[PDB]
PDB file of C-alpha atoms in Angstrom:
ATOM      1  CA  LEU A   1       0.000   0.000   0.000  1.00  0.00           C
ATOM      2  CA  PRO A   2       2.728   2.622   0.606  1.00  0.00           C
ATOM      3  CA  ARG A   3       3.041   4.379  -2.774  1.00  0.00           C
ATOM      4  CA  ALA A   4       5.876   6.801  -2.097  1.00  0.00           C
ATOM      5  CA  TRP A   5       8.021   6.219  -5.214  1.00  0.00           C
ATOM      6  CA  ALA A   6       9.151   9.873  -5.066  1.00  0.00           C
ATOM      7  CA  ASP A   7      10.512   9.689  -1.517  1.00  0.00           C
ATOM      8  CA  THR A   8      14.025   8.335  -0.828  1.00  0.00           C
ATOM      9  CA  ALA A   9      15.449   6.493   2.149  1.00  0.00           C
ATOM     10  CA  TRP A  10      17.820   9.364   2.955  1.00  0.00           C
ATOM     11  CA  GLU A  11      15.187  12.064   2.747  1.00  0.00           C
ATOM     12  CA  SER A  12      12.833  10.012   4.878  1.00  0.00           C
ATOM     13  CA  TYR A  13      15.686   9.610   7.299  1.00  0.00           C
ATOM     14  CA  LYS A  14      16.295  13.374   7.461  1.00  0.00           C
ATOM     15  CA  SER A  15      12.561  13.915   7.857  1.00  0.00           C
ATOM     16  CA  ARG A  16      12.317  11.517  10.778  1.00  0.00           C
ATOM     17  CA  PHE A  17      15.457  12.240  12.738  1.00  0.00           C
ATOM     18  CA  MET A  18      17.143  15.459  11.611  1.00  0.00           C
ATOM     19  CA  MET A  19      16.298  18.741  13.301  1.00  0.00           C
ATOM     20  CA  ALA A  20      16.912  21.875  11.217  1.00  0.00           C
ATOM     21  CA  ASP A  21      19.554  22.954  13.703  1.00  0.00           C
ATOM     22  CA  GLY A  22      21.788  20.024  12.701  1.00  0.00           C
ATOM     23  CA  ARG A  23      20.649  17.662  15.448  1.00  0.00           C
ATOM     24  CA  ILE A  24      20.040  14.007  14.861  1.00  0.00           C
ATOM     25  CA  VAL A  25      17.261  13.151  17.293  1.00  0.00           C
ATOM     26  CA  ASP A  26      16.348   9.670  18.563  1.00  0.00           C
ATOM     27  CA  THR A  27      12.604  10.229  18.644  1.00  0.00           C
ATOM     28  CA  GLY A  28      12.268   6.789  20.231  1.00  0.00           C
ATOM     29  CA  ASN A  29      14.176   7.695  23.399  1.00  0.00           C
ATOM     30  CA  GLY A  30      13.425  11.207  24.579  1.00  0.00           C
ATOM     31  CA  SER A  31      14.680  13.209  21.607  1.00  0.00           C
ATOM     32  CA  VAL A  32      18.298  12.815  22.736  1.00  0.00           C
ATOM     33  CA  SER A  33      21.237  13.197  20.392  1.00  0.00           C
ATOM     34  CA  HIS A  34      24.676  11.679  20.496  1.00  0.00           C
ATOM     35  CA  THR A  35      27.984  11.548  18.673  1.00  0.00           C
ATOM     36  CA  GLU A  36      27.273   8.093  17.287  1.00  0.00           C
ATOM     37  CA  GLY A  37      24.082   9.491  15.800  1.00  0.00           C
ATOM     38  CA  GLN A  38      25.827  12.565  14.474  1.00  0.00           C
ATOM     39  CA  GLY A  39      28.699  10.469  13.101  1.00  0.00           C
ATOM     40  CA  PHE A  40      26.298   8.057  11.405  1.00  0.00           C
ATOM     41  CA  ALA A  41      24.348  10.894   9.837  1.00  0.00           C
ATOM     42  CA  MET A  42      27.476  12.570   8.568  1.00  0.00           C
ATOM     43  CA  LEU A  43      28.699   9.437   6.757  1.00  0.00           C
ATOM     44  CA  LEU A  44      25.294   8.986   5.103  1.00  0.00           C
ATOM     45  CA  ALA A  45      25.242  12.674   4.230  1.00  0.00           C
ATOM     46  CA  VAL A  46      28.596  12.369   2.442  1.00  0.00           C
ATOM     47  CA  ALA A  47      27.609   9.208   0.565  1.00  0.00           C
ATOM     48  CA  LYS A  48      24.326  10.765  -0.439  1.00  0.00           C
ATOM     49  CA  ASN A  49      26.260  13.815  -1.681  1.00  0.00           C
ATOM     50  CA  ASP A  50      24.318  16.086   0.681  1.00  0.00           C
ATOM     51  CA  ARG A  51      26.653  18.896   1.633  1.00  0.00           C
ATOM     52  CA  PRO A  52      24.149  21.225   3.347  1.00  0.00           C
ATOM     53  CA  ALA A  53      23.094  18.302   5.591  1.00  0.00           C
ATOM     54  CA  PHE A  54      26.698  17.412   6.302  1.00  0.00           C
ATOM     55  CA  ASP A  55      27.587  21.019   7.039  1.00  0.00           C
ATOM     56  CA  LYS A  56      24.608  21.427   9.340  1.00  0.00           C
ATOM     57  CA  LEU A  57      25.280  18.151  11.151  1.00  0.00           C
ATOM     58  CA  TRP A  58      28.970  18.943  11.633  1.00  0.00           C
ATOM     59  CA  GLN A  59      28.430  22.585  12.614  1.00  0.00           C
ATOM     60  CA  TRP A  60      25.986  21.544  15.309  1.00  0.00           C
ATOM     61  CA  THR A  61      28.190  18.738  16.543  1.00  0.00           C
ATOM     62  CA  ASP A  62      31.304  20.837  16.767  1.00  0.00           C
ATOM     63  CA  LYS A  63      29.640  23.903  18.280  1.00  0.00           C
ATOM     64  CA  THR A  64      27.679  21.976  20.838  1.00  0.00           C
ATOM     65  CA  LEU A  65      29.623  18.864  21.809  1.00  0.00           C
ATOM     66  CA  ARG A  66      33.315  19.723  21.346  1.00  0.00           C
ATOM     67  CA  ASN A  67      35.253  19.029  24.536  1.00  0.00           C
ATOM     68  CA  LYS A  68      37.953  21.680  24.286  1.00  0.00           C
ATOM     69  CA  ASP A  69      40.137  19.950  26.912  1.00  0.00           C
ATOM     70  CA  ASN A  70      41.057  16.989  24.744  1.00  0.00           C
ATOM     71  CA  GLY A  71      39.563  17.835  21.363  1.00  0.00           C
ATOM     72  CA  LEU A  72      36.999  15.081  21.479  1.00  0.00           C
ATOM     73  CA  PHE A  73      33.232  15.240  21.923  1.00  0.00           C
ATOM     74  CA  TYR A  74      30.870  15.136  24.893  1.00  0.00           C
ATOM     75  CA  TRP A  75      28.994  12.080  23.734  1.00  0.00           C
ATOM     76  CA  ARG A  76      25.301  12.637  24.665  1.00  0.00           C
ATOM     77  CA  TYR A  77      23.016  15.694  24.546  1.00  0.00           C
ATOM     78  CA  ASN A  78      19.679  15.752  26.406  1.00  0.00           C
ATOM     79  CA  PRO A  79      17.765  18.899  25.394  1.00  0.00           C
ATOM     80  CA  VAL A  80      15.284  18.413  28.211  1.00  0.00           C
ATOM     81  CA  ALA A  81      17.730  18.469  31.069  1.00  0.00           C
ATOM     82  CA  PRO A  82      18.997  21.488  33.062  1.00  0.00           C
ATOM     83  CA  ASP A  83      22.450  20.262  32.191  1.00  0.00           C
ATOM     84  CA  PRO A  84      21.818  18.880  28.673  1.00  0.00           C
ATOM     85  CA  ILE A  85      25.296  17.309  28.806  1.00  0.00           C
ATOM     86  CA  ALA A  86      25.494  15.826  32.320  1.00  0.00           C
ATOM     87  CA  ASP A  87      27.838  13.050  31.215  1.00  0.00           C
ATOM     88  CA  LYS A  88      30.949  15.072  30.547  1.00  0.00           C
ATOM     89  CA  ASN A  89      32.806  12.231  28.825  1.00  0.00           C
ATOM     90  CA  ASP A  90      33.276  11.014  25.219  1.00  0.00           C
ATOM     91  CA  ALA A  91      32.412   7.806  23.312  1.00  0.00           C
ATOM     92  CA  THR A  92      35.257   6.791  21.003  1.00  0.00           C
ATOM     93  CA  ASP A  93      33.039   5.174  18.361  1.00  0.00           C
ATOM     94  CA  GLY A  94      31.223   8.484  18.124  1.00  0.00           C
ATOM     95  CA  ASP A  95      34.497  10.431  17.931  1.00  0.00           C
ATOM     96  CA  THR A  96      35.724   8.002  15.295  1.00  0.00           C
ATOM     97  CA  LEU A  97      32.620   8.219  13.128  1.00  0.00           C
ATOM     98  CA  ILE A  98      32.755  11.960  13.143  1.00  0.00           C
ATOM     99  CA  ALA A  99      36.410  12.073  12.194  1.00  0.00           C
ATOM    100  CA  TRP A 100      35.896   9.334   9.672  1.00  0.00           C
ATOM    101  CA  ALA A 101      32.977  11.322   8.167  1.00  0.00           C
ATOM    102  CA  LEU A 102      35.025  14.489   7.908  1.00  0.00           C
ATOM    103  CA  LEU A 103      37.742  12.532   6.119  1.00  0.00           C
ATOM    104  CA  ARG A 104      35.306  11.176   3.543  1.00  0.00           C
ATOM    105  CA  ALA A 105      33.905  14.687   3.294  1.00  0.00           C
ATOM    106  CA  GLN A 106      37.345  15.904   2.178  1.00  0.00           C
ATOM    107  CA  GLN A 107      37.462  13.103  -0.434  1.00  0.00           C
ATOM    108  CA  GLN A 108      33.940  13.929  -1.685  1.00  0.00           C
ATOM    109  CA  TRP A 109      34.160  17.729  -1.802  1.00  0.00           C
ATOM    110  CA  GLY A 110      37.913  18.401  -1.692  1.00  0.00           C
ATOM    111  CA  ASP A 111      37.573  21.070   1.011  1.00  0.00           C
ATOM    112  CA  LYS A 112      40.791  20.603   3.004  1.00  0.00           C
ATOM    113  CA  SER A 113      39.399  22.006   6.249  1.00  0.00           C
ATOM    114  CA  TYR A 114      37.481  18.720   6.534  1.00  0.00           C
ATOM    115  CA  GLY A 115      40.647  16.642   6.502  1.00  0.00           C
ATOM    116  CA  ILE A 116      42.199  19.081   8.984  1.00  0.00           C
ATOM    117  CA  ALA A 117      39.369  18.793  11.479  1.00  0.00           C
ATOM    118  CA  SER A 118      39.476  14.988  10.960  1.00  0.00           C
ATOM    119  CA  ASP A 119      43.233  14.914  11.575  1.00  0.00           C
ATOM    120  CA  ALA A 120      42.818  16.765  14.896  1.00  0.00           C
ATOM    121  CA  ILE A 121      40.167  14.370  16.184  1.00  0.00           C
ATOM    122  CA  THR A 122      42.212  11.304  15.287  1.00  0.00           C
ATOM    123  CA  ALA A 123      45.280  12.807  16.977  1.00  0.00           C
ATOM    124  CA  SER A 124      43.118  13.484  20.016  1.00  0.00           C
ATOM    125  CA  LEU A 125      41.899   9.871  19.882  1.00  0.00           C
ATOM    126  CA  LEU A 126      45.511   8.687  19.800  1.00  0.00           C
ATOM    127  CA  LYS A 127      46.491  11.011  22.658  1.00  0.00           C
ATOM    128  CA  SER A 128      43.691  10.509  25.141  1.00  0.00           C
ATOM    129  CA  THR A 129      42.002   7.165  24.446  1.00  0.00           C
ATOM    130  CA  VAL A 130      44.572   4.732  23.052  1.00  0.00           C
ATOM    131  CA  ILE A 131      46.851   2.909  25.527  1.00  0.00           C
ATOM    132  CA  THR A 132      49.094  -0.110  26.039  1.00  0.00           C
ATOM    133  CA  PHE A 133      47.364  -2.789  28.106  1.00  0.00           C
ATOM    134  CA  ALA A 134      48.453  -6.392  28.223  1.00  0.00           C
ATOM    135  CA  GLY A 135      50.735  -6.771  25.221  1.00  0.00           C
ATOM    136  CA  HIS A 136      48.494  -4.819  22.923  1.00  0.00           C
ATOM    137  CA  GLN A 137      47.351  -1.393  21.710  1.00  0.00           C
ATOM    138  CA  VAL A 138      43.709  -0.643  22.629  1.00  0.00           C
ATOM    139  CA  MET A 139      41.221   2.171  22.259  1.00  0.00           C
ATOM    140  CA  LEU A 140      39.219   2.784  25.388  1.00  0.00           C
ATOM    141  CA  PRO A 141      35.497   3.536  25.059  1.00  0.00           C
ATOM    142  CA  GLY A 142      36.298   6.950  26.481  1.00  0.00           C
ATOM    143  CA  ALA A 143      39.157   9.083  27.742  1.00  0.00           C
ATOM    144  CA  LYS A 144      37.840   8.793  31.310  1.00  0.00           C
ATOM    145  CA  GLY A 145      36.563   5.974  33.484  1.00  0.00           C
ATOM    146  CA  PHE A 146      37.225   2.816  31.500  1.00  0.00           C
ATOM    147  CA  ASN A 147      40.768   2.126  32.642  1.00  0.00           C
ATOM    148  CA  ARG A 148      40.383   0.593  36.067  1.00  0.00           C
ATOM    149  CA  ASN A 149      43.287  -1.207  37.688  1.00  0.00           C
ATOM    150  CA  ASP A 150      43.977  -4.803  36.792  1.00  0.00           C
ATOM    151  CA  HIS A 151      41.676  -4.489  33.804  1.00  0.00           C
ATOM    152  CA  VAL A 152      40.165  -2.158  31.207  1.00  0.00           C
ATOM    153  CA  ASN A 153      36.561  -2.269  30.052  1.00  0.00           C
ATOM    154  CA  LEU A 154      36.371  -2.426  26.283  1.00  0.00           C
ATOM    155  CA  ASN A 155      33.518  -2.367  23.799  1.00  0.00           C
ATOM    156  CA  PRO A 156      34.631  -4.212  20.644  1.00  0.00           C
ATOM    157  CA  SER A 157      31.795  -2.569  18.725  1.00  0.00           C
ATOM    158  CA  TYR A 158      33.914   0.608  19.077  1.00  0.00           C
ATOM    159  CA  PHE A 159      36.613  -1.082  16.997  1.00  0.00           C
ATOM    160  CA  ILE A 160      35.679   0.706  13.773  1.00  0.00           C
ATOM    161  CA  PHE A 161      38.115  -0.973  11.377  1.00  0.00           C
ATOM    162  CA  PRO A 162      37.047   0.736   8.154  1.00  0.00           C
ATOM    163  CA  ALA A 163      37.618   4.108   9.823  1.00  0.00           C
ATOM    164  CA  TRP A 164      40.935   2.943  11.192  1.00  0.00           C
ATOM    165  CA  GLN A 165      41.867   1.725   7.740  1.00  0.00           C
ATOM    166  CA  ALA A 166      41.108   5.227   6.447  1.00  0.00           C
ATOM    167  CA  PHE A 167      42.963   6.881   9.339  1.00  0.00           C
ATOM    168  CA  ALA A 168      45.997   4.739   8.525  1.00  0.00           C
ATOM    169  CA  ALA A 169      45.853   5.527   4.824  1.00  0.00           C
ATOM    170  CA  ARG A 170      45.433   9.294   5.183  1.00  0.00           C
ATOM    171  CA  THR A 171      47.861   9.810   8.052  1.00  0.00           C
ATOM    172  CA  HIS A 172      50.357   6.988   7.231  1.00  0.00           C
ATOM    173  CA  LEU A 173      50.797   6.568  10.990  1.00  0.00           C
ATOM    174  CA  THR A 174      51.775   3.136  12.258  1.00  0.00           C
ATOM    175  CA  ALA A 175      49.712   3.725  15.379  1.00  0.00           C
ATOM    176  CA  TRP A 176      46.530   3.195  13.342  1.00  0.00           C
ATOM    177  CA  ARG A 177      47.940   0.082  11.685  1.00  0.00           C
ATOM    178  CA  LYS A 178      48.983  -1.622  14.895  1.00  0.00           C
ATOM    179  CA  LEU A 179      45.684  -0.591  16.439  1.00  0.00           C
ATOM    180  CA  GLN A 180      43.979  -2.589  13.697  1.00  0.00           C
ATOM    181  CA  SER A 181      46.266  -5.530  14.046  1.00  0.00           C
ATOM    182  CA  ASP A 182      45.956  -5.780  17.798  1.00  0.00           C
ATOM    183  CA  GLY A 183      42.243  -5.180  17.633  1.00  0.00           C
ATOM    184  CA  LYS A 184      41.820  -7.894  15.085  1.00  0.00           C
ATOM    185  CA  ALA A 185      43.943 -10.133  17.331  1.00  0.00           C
ATOM    186  CA  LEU A 186      41.934  -9.410  20.475  1.00  0.00           C
ATOM    187  CA  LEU A 187      38.541  -9.620  18.808  1.00  0.00           C
ATOM    188  CA  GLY A 188      39.540 -13.000  17.452  1.00  0.00           C
ATOM    189  CA  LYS A 189      40.108 -14.244  20.989  1.00  0.00           C
ATOM    190  CA  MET A 190      36.762 -12.732  22.104  1.00  0.00           C
ATOM    191  CA  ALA A 191      34.519 -15.791  21.677  1.00  0.00           C
ATOM    192  CA  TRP A 192      32.290 -17.209  24.436  1.00  0.00           C
ATOM    193  CA  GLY A 193      29.557 -19.766  25.040  1.00  0.00           C
ATOM    194  CA  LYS A 194      28.188 -22.190  22.495  1.00  0.00           C
ATOM    195  CA  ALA A 195      27.920 -19.231  20.079  1.00  0.00           C
ATOM    196  CA  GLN A 196      31.609 -18.289  20.382  1.00  0.00           C
ATOM    197  CA  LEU A 197      30.624 -14.626  20.031  1.00  0.00           C
ATOM    198  CA  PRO A 198      31.715 -11.222  21.464  1.00  0.00           C
ATOM    199  CA  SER A 199      29.735  -9.588  24.221  1.00  0.00           C
ATOM    200  CA  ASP A 200      28.803  -5.890  24.051  1.00  0.00           C
ATOM    201  CA  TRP A 201      31.231  -5.160  26.871  1.00  0.00           C
ATOM    202  CA  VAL A 202      34.515  -6.993  27.509  1.00  0.00           C
ATOM    203  CA  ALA A 203      36.962  -6.798  30.408  1.00  0.00           C
ATOM    204  CA  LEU A 204      40.618  -7.282  29.460  1.00  0.00           C
ATOM    205  CA  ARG A 205      43.016  -8.145  32.294  1.00  0.00           C
ATOM    206  CA  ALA A 206      46.750  -7.318  32.375  1.00  0.00           C
ATOM    207  CA  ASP A 207      47.521 -11.001  31.862  1.00  0.00           C
ATOM    208  CA  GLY A 208      45.436 -10.843  28.676  1.00  0.00           C
ATOM    209  CA  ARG A 209      42.527 -12.786  30.198  1.00  0.00           C
ATOM    210  CA  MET A 210      39.342 -11.522  28.647  1.00  0.00           C
ATOM    211  CA  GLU A 211      35.819 -11.742  29.989  1.00  0.00           C
ATOM    212  CA  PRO A 212      32.348 -10.385  29.260  1.00  0.00           C
ATOM    213  CA  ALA A 213      32.540  -7.380  31.589  1.00  0.00           C
ATOM    214  CA  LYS A 214      30.904  -7.938  34.972  1.00  0.00           C
ATOM    215  CA  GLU A 215      28.900  -4.702  34.987  1.00  0.00           C
ATOM    216  CA  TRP A 216      26.725  -5.347  31.910  1.00  0.00           C
ATOM    217  CA  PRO A 217      24.692  -8.384  30.963  1.00  0.00           C
ATOM    218  CA  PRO A 218      27.119 -10.738  29.169  1.00  0.00           C
ATOM    219  CA  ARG A 219      25.292 -10.476  25.847  1.00  0.00           C
ATOM    220  CA  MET A 220      25.987 -10.226  22.200  1.00  0.00           C
ATOM    221  CA  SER A 221      23.184  -7.665  21.812  1.00  0.00           C
ATOM    222  CA  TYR A 222      22.564  -4.096  20.696  1.00  0.00           C
ATOM    223  CA  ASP A 223      26.240  -3.127  20.445  1.00  0.00           C
ATOM    224  CA  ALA A 224      28.053  -6.303  19.512  1.00  0.00           C
ATOM    225  CA  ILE A 225      25.786  -6.819  16.514  1.00  0.00           C
ATOM    226  CA  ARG A 226      27.623  -3.871  14.886  1.00  0.00           C
ATOM    227  CA  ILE A 227      30.946  -5.764  14.794  1.00  0.00           C
ATOM    228  CA  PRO A 228      30.135  -7.845  11.709  1.00  0.00           C
ATOM    229  CA  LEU A 229      28.767  -4.667  10.112  1.00  0.00           C
ATOM    230  CA  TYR A 230      32.151  -3.024  10.590  1.00  0.00           C
ATOM    231  CA  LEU A 231      34.025  -6.193   9.675  1.00  0.00           C
ATOM    232  CA  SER A 232      32.272  -6.743   6.377  1.00  0.00           C
ATOM    233  CA  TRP A 233      32.491  -3.039   5.658  1.00  0.00           C
ATOM    234  CA  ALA A 234      36.271  -3.127   5.884  1.00  0.00           C
ATOM    235  CA  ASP A 235      36.809  -6.537   4.233  1.00  0.00           C
ATOM    236  CA  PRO A 236      33.796  -8.615   3.217  1.00  0.00           C
ATOM    237  CA  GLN A 237      36.090 -11.647   3.105  1.00  0.00           C
ATOM    238  CA  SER A 238      37.513 -10.927   6.594  1.00  0.00           C
ATOM    239  CA  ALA A 239      38.163 -14.180   8.452  1.00  0.00           C
ATOM    240  CA  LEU A 240      36.715 -12.599  11.587  1.00  0.00           C
ATOM    241  CA  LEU A 241      33.271 -12.830  10.004  1.00  0.00           C
ATOM    242  CA  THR A 242      33.417 -16.614  10.462  1.00  0.00           C
ATOM    243  CA  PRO A 243      31.961 -16.859  14.014  1.00  0.00           C
ATOM    244  CA  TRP A 244      29.136 -14.678  12.753  1.00  0.00           C
ATOM    245  CA  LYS A 245      28.385 -16.550   9.529  1.00  0.00           C
ATOM    246  CA  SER A 246      28.403 -19.697  11.647  1.00  0.00           C
ATOM    247  CA  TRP A 247      25.958 -18.310  14.148  1.00  0.00           C
ATOM    248  CA  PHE A 248      23.538 -16.865  11.613  1.00  0.00           C
ATOM    249  CA  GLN A 249      23.682 -20.108   9.658  1.00  0.00           C
ATOM    250  CA  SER A 250      22.641 -21.841  12.844  1.00  0.00           C
ATOM    251  CA  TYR A 251      19.225 -20.081  12.750  1.00  0.00           C
ATOM    252  CA  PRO A 252      16.385 -19.576  10.230  1.00  0.00           C
ATOM    253  CA  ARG A 253      16.602 -16.085   8.722  1.00  0.00           C
ATOM    254  CA  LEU A 254      13.278 -14.971  10.212  1.00  0.00           C
ATOM    255  CA  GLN A 255      13.810 -16.729  13.533  1.00  0.00           C
ATOM    256  CA  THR A 256      17.238 -15.431  14.605  1.00  0.00           C
ATOM    257  CA  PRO A 257      17.310 -14.307  18.241  1.00  0.00           C
ATOM    258  CA  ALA A 258      17.824 -10.544  18.652  1.00  0.00           C
ATOM    259  CA  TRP A 259      20.526 -11.338  21.168  1.00  0.00           C
ATOM    260  CA  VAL A 260      22.289 -14.176  22.956  1.00  0.00           C
ATOM    261  CA  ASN A 261      23.734 -14.451  26.419  1.00  0.00           C
ATOM    262  CA  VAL A 262      27.284 -15.696  25.961  1.00  0.00           C
ATOM    263  CA  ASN A 263      27.616 -16.814  29.570  1.00  0.00           C
ATOM    264  CA  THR A 264      24.507 -18.957  29.841  1.00  0.00           C
ATOM    265  CA  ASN A 265      23.699 -19.462  26.140  1.00  0.00           C
ATOM    266  CA  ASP A 266      20.172 -18.206  26.762  1.00  0.00           C
ATOM    267  CA  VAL A 267      18.674 -16.074  23.995  1.00  0.00           C
ATOM    268  CA  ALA A 268      16.325 -13.134  23.445  1.00  0.00           C
ATOM    269  CA  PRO A 269      12.559 -13.811  23.392  1.00  0.00           C
ATOM    270  CA  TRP A 270      12.129 -12.002  20.046  1.00  0.00           C
ATOM    271  CA  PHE A 271      13.677 -12.284  16.597  1.00  0.00           C
ATOM    272  CA  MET A 272      15.757  -9.990  14.478  1.00  0.00           C
ATOM    273  CA  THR A 273      13.865  -7.855  11.956  1.00  0.00           C
ATOM    274  CA  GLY A 274      14.643  -4.689   9.991  1.00  0.00           C
ATOM    275  CA  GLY A 275      18.070  -3.306  10.762  1.00  0.00           C
ATOM    276  CA  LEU A 276      19.409  -6.309  12.646  1.00  0.00           C
ATOM    277  CA  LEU A 277      18.217  -8.526   9.822  1.00  0.00           C
ATOM    278  CA  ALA A 278      19.946  -6.184   7.405  1.00  0.00           C
ATOM    279  CA  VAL A 279      23.102  -6.893   9.329  1.00  0.00           C
ATOM    280  CA  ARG A 280      22.491 -10.635   9.115  1.00  0.00           C
ATOM    281  CA  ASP A 281      21.936 -10.487   5.387  1.00  0.00           C
ATOM    282  CA  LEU A 282      25.193  -8.527   5.131  1.00  0.00           C
ATOM    283  CA  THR A 283      27.100 -11.153   7.127  1.00  0.00           C
ATOM    284  CA  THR A 284      25.614 -14.070   5.180  1.00  0.00           C
ATOM    285  CA  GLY A 285      25.609 -12.408   1.783  1.00  0.00           C
ATOM    286  CA  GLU A 286      21.861 -12.777   1.267  1.00  0.00           C
ATOM    287  CA  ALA A 287      20.817 -10.206  -1.357  1.00  0.00           C
ATOM    288  CA  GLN A 288      19.306  -7.078   0.118  1.00  0.00           C
ATOM    289  CA  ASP A 289      17.006  -4.586  -1.517  1.00  0.00           C
ATOM    290  CA  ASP A 290      17.917  -0.923  -1.102  1.00  0.00           C
ATOM    291  CA  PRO A 291      16.705   0.172   2.362  1.00  0.00           C
ATOM    292  CA  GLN A 292      13.080   1.128   2.492  1.00  0.00           C
ATOM    293  CA  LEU A 293      12.338   2.948   5.698  1.00  0.00           C
ATOM    294  CA  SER A 294       8.873   2.319   7.092  1.00  0.00           C
ATOM    295  CA  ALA A 295       7.242   3.769  10.182  1.00  0.00           C
ATOM    296  CA  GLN A 296       7.655   0.286  11.663  1.00  0.00           C
ATOM    297  CA  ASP A 297      11.387   1.091  11.830  1.00  0.00           C
ATOM    298  CA  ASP A 298      12.641   2.834  14.984  1.00  0.00           C
ATOM    299  CA  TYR A 299      15.757   4.959  15.187  1.00  0.00           C
ATOM    300  CA  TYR A 300      18.248   2.107  15.530  1.00  0.00           C
ATOM    301  CA  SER A 301      16.737  -0.117  12.835  1.00  0.00           C
ATOM    302  CA  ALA A 302      16.498   2.679  10.284  1.00  0.00           C
ATOM    303  CA  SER A 303      20.114   3.511  11.042  1.00  0.00           C
ATOM    304  CA  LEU A 304      21.360  -0.052  10.632  1.00  0.00           C
ATOM    305  CA  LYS A 305      19.472  -0.219   7.358  1.00  0.00           C
ATOM    306  CA  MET A 306      21.295   2.848   6.062  1.00  0.00           C
ATOM    307  CA  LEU A 307      24.719   1.816   7.387  1.00  0.00           C
ATOM    308  CA  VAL A 308      24.398  -1.626   5.880  1.00  0.00           C
ATOM    309  CA  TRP A 309      23.503   0.158   2.659  1.00  0.00           C
ATOM    310  CA  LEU A 310      26.639   2.313   2.909  1.00  0.00           C
ATOM    311  CA  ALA A 311      28.941  -0.615   3.772  1.00  0.00           C
ATOM    312  CA  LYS A 312      27.656  -2.246   0.581  1.00  0.00           C
ATOM    313  CA  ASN A 313      28.132   1.028  -1.265  1.00  0.00           C
ATOM    314  CA  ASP A 314      31.864   1.242  -0.573  1.00  0.00           C
ATOM    315  CA  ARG A 315      32.434  -1.286  -3.343  1.00  0.00           C
TER     316      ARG A 315
END
């Protein structure tokens, strides 16, 4: 019944989630914004050759969320709070996506200020959020509060390899190359339960012992599911996709659990649809139609749809 041949996925996306001030708004959860959302929107905006949207999104991000102390970004903005940025700390996937977007901006429109801005974020990322723990280089989920004592709490879904690839190519720095290599090494050792899958949050101990972090439910759920998105995006024949192809293969396309507990092997009471399913089809190589965004899609699902589309597009 929906006859909207003249609408596009990207315009629908702007219509649903983009405020005129440059804000991406998660209308599902209290009209909040965040650097992941901004970063996501900026990549799409470049790929869609939408410079006014990119310029608006960036301008708002930089004016509103730039942490001048370290050059990163206060990660969440809550317009309906006395302090709309109570959490004065960054999320490194968000930082990454922004810098990555700016880089691709430079490539798309040649404006060198983009690359410059990008450069300064990635140097800030290197300065404040990358460290040596165990025998490896790691990027903490944030400059503050993730390095504990005997361990660090990591989120492997923050390991944005295709960005890192781009950082390494533009800057030529070895830091970005080793960060990929060590990240690919660690991730590979991050398998648990019958699934042998990554949890959203992982604790890495100085001895290199890794564990689904105590403080969150030990699930492959709303974060971890992004890993194969990033993996396939950076190398569709990546050997790290294997645990994921194996797991998807283990379920019927329309009855794949939305998440799995990797400690107890228990699974979610509902099945992947929309965005998550777009991720599955990406991992398994099952042909996907260009994203059609319906009202039945919430903020995350519509986003996954578009990102999966863009990961496909980079070939």
